[PDB]
Ligand SMILES: CC(=O)N[C@H]1[C@H](O[C@@H]2[C@@H](O)[C@H](O)O[C@H](CO)[C@@H]2O)O[C@H](CO)[C@@H](O[C@@H]2O[C@H](CO)[C@H](O)[C@H](O[C@]3(C(=O)O)C[C@H](O)[C@@H](NC(C)=O)[C@H]([C@H](O)[C@H](O)CO)O3)[C@H]2O)[C@@H]1O[C@@H]1O[C@@H](C)[C@@H](O)[C@@H](O)[C@@H]1O
């Protein structure tokens with residue numbers, strides 16, 4: 001059994017499904033039933049959280065975290081990792097056929113793990129948690145960073161890494177809980193953490209800030225006060241006033257057994273407060289989803305591009321796609337109704353799958369469309385809803401379950417059947433279950449109908 | 453990766469865990485959390501039912517049935533099959549690691565499938581359903597019988613079989629929805645169906661009947677009238693008054709690619725109306741669980757032994773273990789409170805795992821103990837409850853979930869860790885889920901504490 005998807009999907013993966021730059025109407029089909037490839041808990045009160053999923057050209061990779069006790073717990077966790085392929089069934093649609101399983105259960109508390117599809121298997125970026133996240137940010141030395149390689153030949157290799165730029169500049173660093181990508185001999189993971197304000201990186205980036213504005217819902221105040229507030233929002237006292245910063249872990253794949261990798265840190269003039277995220281490669285164009293952990297409540301997706309150097313001076317340039325369609329739930333001054341800059345550590349991971357390019361060779365596509373799963377609430381993680389959205393407004397909505405159903409993290413991936421032109425989107429959602437407790441992570445496969 | 457369980461379980465599988473013949477107290481531990489090896493549905497209203505599970509010395513085999521639509525008809529299903537091993541985790545207990553998956557999805561409605569662990573893989577006995585079960589019993593020719601062999605080398609071989617004794621004697625025959633066994637070059641599956649009363653087998657067994665009596669809850673009436681009612685209870689008009697009959701599909705394993713197998717039919721003087729069942733091999737002793745589909749509401753477990761012939765006249769001996777502990781739910785005059793002979797097609801599959809021998813060379817063990825999952829109701833499939841039970845009474849009870857939780861089929865298997873003497877029982881239960889609908893089949897692994 002080769003680690004190869006069914007041929008009708010190989011050339012419909014990581015492509016822009018809509019490239020006419022025109023307006024379109026959308027319909028989200030009903031969930032297509034199959035044996036779920038994501039295992040649930042086996043107890044009513046075990047914790048099962050933090051999904052990470054990547055569909056590559058030839059196979060997919062998946063992982064999440066399992067705790068034998070309540071989600072509020074400190075002893076340790078375990079990491080379920082799997083890889084598999086897409087197989088067409090006689091029901092008329094594909095299913096995710098698991099081919100390899102690896103349950104990392106050795107007493108090491110690997111946390112916040114991000115997975116990526118690599119030649120012949122998967123790569124996983126974790127940190128080893130030994131204390132509270134707030135303790136991480138209050139300290140001055142980052143936790144242990146681990147890189148795990150899982151191959152189809154059943155080989156597993158785990159290494160501790162110290163990427164260039166980490167030591168001396170960061171109080172803490174964790175993976176972005178969103179899939180990384182394998183791109184031009186580079187393995188790229190999202191990451192975020194706390195930068196020491198007095199360090200070299202802290203002093204260099206001390207005055208960097210980005211303040212997106214919704215023209216239809218502007219924040220009240222003078223430009224200077226809003227800019228000062230947006231700058232202050234990068235240093236929440238909940239995280240000991242560190243500069244909370246997004247970054248990219250970049251590893252040379254050809255040297256993946258010996259390299260320590262490299263931290264590429266974006267300019268905070270182009271990106272908001274560091275948060276969970278995801279790196280996508282569509283039509284050989286790199287995108288970065290950033291969770292709206294800070295005051296800005298709308299969906300954050302950037303077009304990104306790297307400049308790689310031999311000496312360790314790589315850089316990344318980020319370009320925000322102006323999206324103000326829907327808001328994510330948050331608490332206090334950081335709910336979905338807040339649009340003004342303020343110190344926030346709130347929100348929830350909800351990533352988007354872009355169906356259209358935004359920047360193309362001939363210009364910019366204002367008819368941008370993206371799809372995903374949102375939480376229909378401004379304060380609470382509840383009401384999972386499949387959606388297709390434009391830049392300014394929602395195009396179509398389809399709830400999953402009844403109103404009042406609790407849901408948290410969602411990650412969405414779309415691909416096309418090149419045999420019959422069917423467009424499939426899988427919405428992987430943390431759903432509250434009555435029998436397995438905090439989040440059965442469910443992959444809902446639907447067919448997306450696109451018309452004029 | 454060899455298809456071999458962790459060594460600490462190899463000699464603790466298919467053994468009698470309690471062999472002192474003494475009285476014991478029991479405590480059922482809390483569910484132990486792990487990634488469930490049984491996939492759920494991926495839609496809120498897809499059907500996922502009919503679990504079959506076998507734990508062999510070196511590996512386990514599992515299967516169940518998946519319908520993209522409601523459990524009511526659709527007349528099209530798929531069969532999920534998996535095989536794997538037991539692996540100890542750092543959490544202190546084993547988990548079930550799936551090593552091979554096979555999703556039979558080709559438009560053939562394989563139904564009521566029974567799985568068995570065989571050298572290098574699994575064997576599955578199904579029938580191809582094309583109409584209602586009542587239509588099967590109303591007809592005069594049994595449906596297609598299929599045998600599927602799945603090996604670790606990823607080879608799948610399916611054959612249509614016509615076992616000796618089937619044609620001319622049966623209106624219909626289906627597998628027993630309980631695991632078969634590989635024993636002395638024989639592959640033995642439970643089965644049941646409808647015998648044509650006018651056929652050779654029908655006239656031979658015309659006066660055979662078994663009427664168990666609970667000495668603590670006897671049915672009132674004369675012996676002869678009750679005997680006539682118990683004889684008539686084998687011919688329900690719901691199944692067109694055929695003789696509903698249990699049987700055993702026996703295949704020569706060395707000739708499994710070419711043999712047609714053989715129907716070994718027990719005497720109905722020793723067994724109740726034909727129903728689903730399970731074949732167990734513990735300490736080289738064969739046992740048969742029979743679902744209480746007929747009027748008798750208590751747990752049916754028989755010690756069985758085969759006499760094999762070369763010419764096709766094999767026979768089976770059945771010896772009922774007298775159990776009157778708890779009752780299964782049923783409707784109408786066939787509820788758990790009915791103990792009088794009457795025509796019944798009711799009940800639910802709930803099989804037992806015996807912890808002790810019943811018959812041994814020196815005598816009979818009155819301190820028999822067995823464990824499983826029951827439904828705490830006399831009329832409704834609701835309130836799944838783990839239990840340890842003696843012959844006459846329940847020793848310990850532990851509900852799963854809240855009162856009012858709907859549950860149907862349960863199958864239980866226990867094994868022992870020979871490293872630390874831990875006794876583990878897995879209770880595989882069809883549970884009603886709020887997000888994946890009719891029955892997430894959940895494997896609940898618990899530790900069983902046994903004292904004096
Ligand atoms: C008492 C309380 O509610 N505390 C919150 C905390 O509130 C504070 C205020 O007290 C303070 O004054 O102001 C700040 C804003 O400046 C803030 O509002 O906010 C915490 C951050 O949201 C929150 O922790 C979060 O709890 C939720 C529970 O719903 C969840 O566990 C979050 O975790 C996840 C997630 O978003 O689901 C998942 C991962 O485990 C996290 N990764 C890591 C590496 O830890 C990830 C991560 O935190 C984010 O990406 C941000 O970096 O988020 C928590 O972040 C406090 O909630 C309490 O503490 C939690 C640890 C948990 O025990 C909750 O049950 C508590 O109520």
Ligand SMILES: CC(=O)N[C@H]1[C@H](O[C@@H]2[C@@H](O)[C@H](O)O[C@H](CO)[C@@H]2O)O[C@H](CO)[C@@H](O[C@@H]2O[C@H](CO)[C@H](O)[C@H](O[C@]3(C(=O)O)C[C@H](O)[C@@H](NC(C)=O)[C@H]([C@H](O)[C@H](O)CO)O3)[C@H]2O)[C@@H]1O[C@@H]1O[C@@H](C)[C@@H](O)[C@@H](O)[C@@H]1O
Pocket residue numbers: 524563564585626688689690727728745783784795796797798799800801860
């Ligand atoms: C209208 C109704 O309720 N009909 C029942 C039927 O009731 C009749 C009475 O109407 C009649 O007067 O008297 C007889 C007794 O003489 C009987 O009570 O009983 C049927 C049997 O119990 C029942 O079918 C069962 O329905 C349940 C639904 O809860 C379930 O689908 C059962 O299936 C299973 C099971 O036990 O869960 C599983 C397998 O699919 C079955 N195997 C095969 C090969 O088909 C297996 C099998 O039937 C048993 O092992 C018996 O051999 O049982 C059904 O058996 C009737 O329910 C209706 O018909 C169902 C098919 C379904 O459509 C229900 O929704 C209907 O109400």
Ligand SMILES: *[C@@H]1O[C@H](CO)[C@@H](O[C@@H]2O[C@H](CO)[C@@H](O)[C@H](O)[C@H]2NC(C)=O)[C@H](O)[C@H]1NC(C)=O
Pocket residue numbers: 119120151152153155256257
């Ligand atoms: C299992 O597969 C991995 C990846 O395909 C193999 O790893 C490579 O092995 C060669 C040895 O010739 C090295 O030069 C490469 O650098 C390795 N790549 C990585 C990413 O580690 C591994 O050898 C295989 N193991 C087997 C076949 O036993």
Ligand SMILES: *[C@@H]1O[C@H](CO)[C@@H](O[C@@H]2O[C@H](CO)[C@@H](O)[C@H](O)[C@H]2NC(C)=O)[C@H](O)[C@H]1NC(C)=O
Pocket residue numbers: 270317318319320
């Ligand atoms: C890096 O990304 C930024 C976006 O943040 C690019 O700047 C934009 O460029 C386009 C096209 O040239 C202009 O229409 C925008 O007005 C620019 N925005 C800003 C804020 O300057 C930039 O071109 C990219 N490349 C480099 C080298 O900076």
Ligand SMILES: *[C@@H]1O[C@H](CO)[C@@H](O[C@@H]2O[C@H](CO)[C@@H](O)[C@H](O)[C@H]2NC(C)=O)[C@H](O)[C@H]1NC(C)=O
Pocket residue numbers: 571572603604605607708709
């Ligand atoms: C896969 O495994 C099965 C079972 O281990 C193999 O089946 C045997 O193959 C030999 C080779 O001719 C036969 O003589 C036996 O009778 C087969 N046994 C059974 C039970 O079928 C099969 O050959 C293996 N396939 C491959 C490709 O290696």
Ligand SMILES: *[C@@H]1O[C@H](CO)[C@@H](O[C@@H]2O[C@H](CO)[C@@H](O)[C@H](O)[C@H]2NC(C)=O)[C@H](O)[C@H]1NC(C)=O
Pocket residue numbers: 722769770771772
């Ligand atoms: C066939 O099974 C029957 C059980 O139905 C066995 O009969 C029992 O035998 C024991 C010991 O000989 C007696 O104490 C019981 O009274 C018998 N019960 C009945 C109902 O007859 C019988 O021994 C079995 N045959 C063989 C050869 O083992």
Ligand SMILES: *[C@@H]1O[C@H](CO)[C@@H](O)[C@H](O)[C@H]1NC(C)=O
Pocket residue numbers: 207208209267269
């Ligand atoms: C960031 O923006 C500030 C103005 O707010 C400017 O002074 C600084 O040079 C910018 N830095 C970068 C790297 O763009």
Ligand SMILES: *[C@@H]1O[C@H](CO)[C@@H](O)[C@H](O)[C@H]1NC(C)=O
Pocket residue numbers: 326376385397
């Ligand atoms: C949220 O649900 C309400 C129904 O109570 C509906 O009117 C609204 O459109 C939904 N919003 C989103 C973003 O799904």
Ligand SMILES: *[C@@H]1O[C@H](CO)[C@@H](O)[C@H](O)[C@H]1NC(C)=O
Pocket residue numbers: 659660661719721
């Ligand atoms: C079954 O019992 C009847 C009496 O009810 C008897 O005549 C018959 O011989 C018995 N058959 C067997 C096989 O035990």
Ligand SMILES: *[C@@H]1O[C@H](CO)[C@@H](O)[C@H](O)[C@H]1NC(C)=O
Pocket residue numbers: 778828837849
């Ligand atoms: C069923 O539940 C009731 C509580 O309503 C309890 O009294 C009874 O013992 C339970 N029976 C079993 C067999 O669990």
